[PDB]
Amino acid sequence: SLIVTTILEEPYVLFKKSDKPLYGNDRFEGYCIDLLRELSTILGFTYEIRLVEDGKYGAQDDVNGQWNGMVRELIDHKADLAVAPLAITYVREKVIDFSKPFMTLGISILYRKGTPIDSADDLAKQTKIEYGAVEDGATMTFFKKSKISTYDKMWAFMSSRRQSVLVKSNEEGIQRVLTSDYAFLMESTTIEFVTQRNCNLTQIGGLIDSKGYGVGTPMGSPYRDKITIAILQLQEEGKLHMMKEKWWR
Amino acid sequence: SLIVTTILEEPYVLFKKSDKPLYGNDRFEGYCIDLLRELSTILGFTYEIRLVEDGKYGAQDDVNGQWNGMVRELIDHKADLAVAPLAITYVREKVIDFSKPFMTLGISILYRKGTPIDSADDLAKQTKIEYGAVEDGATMTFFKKSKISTYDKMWAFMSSRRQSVLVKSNEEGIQRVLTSDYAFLMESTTIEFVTQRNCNLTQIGGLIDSKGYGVGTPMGSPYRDKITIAILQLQEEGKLHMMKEKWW
Numbered sequence: 001s002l003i004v005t006t007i008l009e010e011p012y013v014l015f016k017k018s019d020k021p022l023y024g025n026d027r028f029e030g031y032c033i034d035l036l037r038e039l040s041t042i043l044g045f046t047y048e049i050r051l052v053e054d055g056k057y058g059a060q061d062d063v064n065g066q067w068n069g070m071v072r073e074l075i076d077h078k079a080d081l082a083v084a085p086l087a088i089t090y091v092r093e094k095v096i097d098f099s100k101p102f103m104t105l106g107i108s109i110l111y112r113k114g115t116p117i118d119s120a121d122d123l124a125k126q127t128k129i130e131y132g133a134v135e136d137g138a139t140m141t142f143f144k145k146s147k148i149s150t151y152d153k154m155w156a157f158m159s160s161r162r163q164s165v166l167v168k169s170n171e172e173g174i175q176r177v178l179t180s181d182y183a184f185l186m187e188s189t190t191i192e193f194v195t196q197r198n199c200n201l202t203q204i205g206g207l208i209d210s211k212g213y214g215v216g217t218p219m220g221s222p223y224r225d226k227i228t229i230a231i232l233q234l235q236e237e238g239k240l241h242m243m244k245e246k247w248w249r
Numbered sequence: 250s251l252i253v254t255t256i257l258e259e260p261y262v263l264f265k266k267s268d269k270p271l272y273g274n275d276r277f278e279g280y281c282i283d284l285l286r287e288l289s290t291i292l293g294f295t296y297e298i299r300l301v302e303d304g305k306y307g308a309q310d311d312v313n314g315q316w317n318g319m320v321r322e323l324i325d326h327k328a329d330l331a332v333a334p335l336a337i338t339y340v341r342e343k344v345i346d347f348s349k350p351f352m353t354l355g356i357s358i359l360y361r362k363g364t365p366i367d368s369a370d371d372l373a374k375q376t377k378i379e380y381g382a383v384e385d386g387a388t389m390t391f392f393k394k395s396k397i398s399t400y401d402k403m404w405a406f407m408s409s410r411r412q413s414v415l416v417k418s419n420e421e422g423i424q425r426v427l428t429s430d431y432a433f434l435m436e437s438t439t440i441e442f443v444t445q446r447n448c449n450l451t452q453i454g455g456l457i458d459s460k461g462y463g464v465g466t467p468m469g470s471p472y473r474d475k476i477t478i479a480i481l482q483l484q485e486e487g488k489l490h491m492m493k494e495k496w497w
């Protein structure tokens with residue numbers, strides 16, 4: 001059986017609700033759990049889902065250049081696959097492999113409706129409304145590495161207030177938007193899930209970039225290209241779209 | 250130096266307009282030519298651009314299983330790369346390799362404005378308005394293979410009328426929409442180029458599927474993963490976005 005690392009993130013991966021105790025893979029449900037099941041149907045592998053220990057997606061540390069999160073688990077061969085909303089990025093592709101994308105997305109802004117804020121630039125040009133992102137994720141890394149003035153300014157702001165504006169999880173960021181004057185830089189796919197359930201919230205502006213979620217594998221894994229082929233089949237059959245419809249309702 | 254196969258298709262690849270006759274790589278410009286130039290800078294290769302001889306993207310003969318177009322050029326190792334609006338598909342990924350996508354898109358419908366036609370289903374349930382797609386491309390292949398009722402029905406319509414409703418190129422299909430009661434199934438990226446320039450035309454409905462364009466290589470090529478990393482570099486620095494804005 002393949003060891004599959006993943007992370008709790010609605011509506012991709014969550015704990016299934018039952019009146020009775022649940023065990024093994026049956027504990028989990030969500031878009032990525034359905035994806036994993038479909039991949040196993042096509043490719044014929046068995047698997048064991050395990051939540052990532054540190055609860056992080058994956059980032060490289062400045063000083064010791066060590067990785068954390070699901071990325072680290074693949075690097076160290078503690079997992080065979082990462083099936084999660086894991087963004088395919090330049091720096092990650094240098095240390096792990098990824099299937100082709102099963103979903104495409106971009107960074108955008110989650111905030112309230114009816115305000116004068118209409119873009120990242122509007123946030124960058126002020127300090128009254130705090131804004132931030134998930135710590136040690138692809139969104140934070142985008143801002144940290146950007147040479148675009150607007151985003152460079154936004155990183156300077158977030159970095160100098162790390163403790164107060166960066167959050168541990170999307171759920172924490174979403175809660176901050178709901179309970180304080182705060183705008184959250186996060187992925188558009190997940191924004192769509194939030195805005196269909198919270199009618200006072202909206203995406204602000206467009207997509208700031210473009211990226212895909214892919215299944216992660218250790219570098220050189222033979223499963224990478226097989227999973228790509230299975231994803232392409234599921235897309236063309238209309239199955240990924242049905243799965244998106246099911247979980248984003 | 251690498252041999253790069255490609256295909257004429259606005260605004261991805263076109264012949265540069267000029268008074269002085271042009272030679273070799275100078276003959277070409279477009280989104281995909283800019284992409285090729287950026288990839289060459291990052292990876293440090295030189296290249297010769299050659300248009301695909303048979304003028305096709307690539308499909309498999311369903312009797313003997315032989316391929317044509319750019320896909321065939323890669324299979325036969327007649328080109329090192331295909332840099333073009335070449336859709337990454339299940340059937341192609343089994344015979345060639347692709348970089349990760351530099352652009353994402355989906356099949357949709359090009360038609361005229363002001364009608365009650367709002368979806369593929371609306372087209373499928375009638376015959377007065379003819380519809381078709383490019384022969385031997387990914388869009389046609391999607392319909393040919395689909396188990397989805399509506400799309401299976403549309404394939405029955407298109408295949409039975411192959412001579413009259415399938416076209417050799419996007420340009421031919423677009424001209425048909427402009428000059429007759431015809432709706433053209435084509436890729437949303439290319440629709441966007443067209444509707445920005447022809448105000449009487451519009452996309453009908455949403456995306457019917459989702460796919461990306463990738464740089465093609467022969468199976469097992471070491472350039473594949475290198476080009477993926479270069480594409481990710483270009484995306485992250487904002488260049489792919491600037492490239493699309495320039496050509497659209």
Ligand SMILES: N[C@@H](CCC(=O)O)C(=O)O
Pocket residue numbers: 057058085086087133134136137138139140185186187
């Ligand atoms: N999906 C992101 C985490 C969330 C975010 O950074 O917005 C990643 O793969 O790192």
Ligand SMILES: N[C@@H](CCC(=O)O)C(=O)O
Pocket residue numbers: 306307334335336382383385386387388389434435436
């Ligand atoms: N871009 C398509 C051709 C055009 C189409 O099929 O709509 C391909 O790669 O085959």
Ligand SMILES: [Cl-]
Pocket residue numbers: 098099100228347348349477
């Ligand atoms: Cl790949």
Ligand code: NA
Pocket residue numbers: 092093094095096097098219
């Ligand atoms: Na890699």
Ligand code: NA
Pocket residue numbers: 341342343344345346347468
């Ligand atoms: Na392949």
